[PDB]
Amino acid sequence: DIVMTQTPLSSAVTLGQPASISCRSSQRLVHSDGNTYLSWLHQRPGQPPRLLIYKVSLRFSGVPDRFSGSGAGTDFTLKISRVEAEDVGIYYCMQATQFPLTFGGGTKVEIKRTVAAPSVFIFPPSDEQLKSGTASVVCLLNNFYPREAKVQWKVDNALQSGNSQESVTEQDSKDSTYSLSSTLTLSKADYEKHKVYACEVTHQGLSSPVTKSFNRGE
Amino acid sequence: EVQLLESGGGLVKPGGSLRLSCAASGFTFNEYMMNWVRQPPGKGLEWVSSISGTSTYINYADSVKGRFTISRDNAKNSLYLQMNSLRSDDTAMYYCARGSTGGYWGQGTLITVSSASTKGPSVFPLAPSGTAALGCLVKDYFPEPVTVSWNSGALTSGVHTFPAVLQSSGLYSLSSVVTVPSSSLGTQTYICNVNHKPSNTKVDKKVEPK
């Protein structure tokens, strides 16, 4: 079996600047017909892969010429001559020279943009959810960069540890930012024992942490 | 244009079986090898199986050999995958794909192999308090996926639908949020349209200011 070793695992690139992805085959990649069959694909979240390059260096219809592929023997490369915001996502090499067909492990491309502080919003539980016996409290960090952020929940000044879950979007294909949600879930019986619900956000773009809070029921 | 569309996925218990289908159009079907490729949660692409144009050559990944059977019906422009003795680690998005280049793919269909049962979500408003934010919390569902739109597709700018999180209960939850002009609150209506096809649960929830 031909193992495709794809590097780097992730690459962060300034807008308009070049990017390069390498895939090395465990053995010389040559078909009985003399050619080499290797493709490069790009996949966005929630979408099928899209073909960029096939047969090592041929561009698929619709693919802009800033993408190119090259290589021979065991070393193959995808080049992006100038990255655009929409180039974020995961790139894969695929060899279809010999069964079993195999893929590289993927490379995630990130666009490096200027620091952007999150806008922070807190959402109390709905009356409908409370009536059913549960309280979910949501903290939203919107449109920030870079991805690193810290969110801390406090309930009547008690730091919550293990009572919340976070989700982060993939990098936006237009503005190159991230968004994040953190959800604290409690029973109604527990929720109604406390007054102040607060989320405190730390991020490089904030000179000091931002807190959003509410009082239960008022 | 070339079209490929998968069907037959869904939730099944360990040890169970499913049959995937892929309907093709827009090309001469019997001139091309056809393939199944899968993508486990959080992982890369992995080839599953291939079948040449007139079924002469059939190939399988070692991890599915003896359990999965690929076939095609050229008169019906259809590709099949019979999947037996399924295991939790067969959970993945399954794609059909044409040929040897990776140029044409279906949209994929999710196979979840789990002892957990189907459950539809509850949908709760995230009510808005410059720029305001509002959303909907889509809580306690299984299996994936759910889809969310806003205002029946009329509202797309500023929407973020977060990746689902598996709660410690074994059920998924996600939120979808949108940022909107504060001046629009209480004037423009905002409705989140949630569809959890595995449970046949569809909800349109109005999100009103506190």
Binding site: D1, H31, S32, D33, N35, Y37, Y54, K55, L58, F60, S61, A96, T97, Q98, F99, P100, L101 | F27, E31, Y32, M33, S50, S52, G53, Y57, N59, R98, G99, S100, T101, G103
Partner: peptide
């Protein structure tokens, strides 16, 4: 060219 290349069969193991 793509359709022609896409008809190629990978070599067997």
């Amino acid at each position: 060219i793509h359709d022609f290349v896409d008809k190629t069969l990978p070599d067997q193991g």
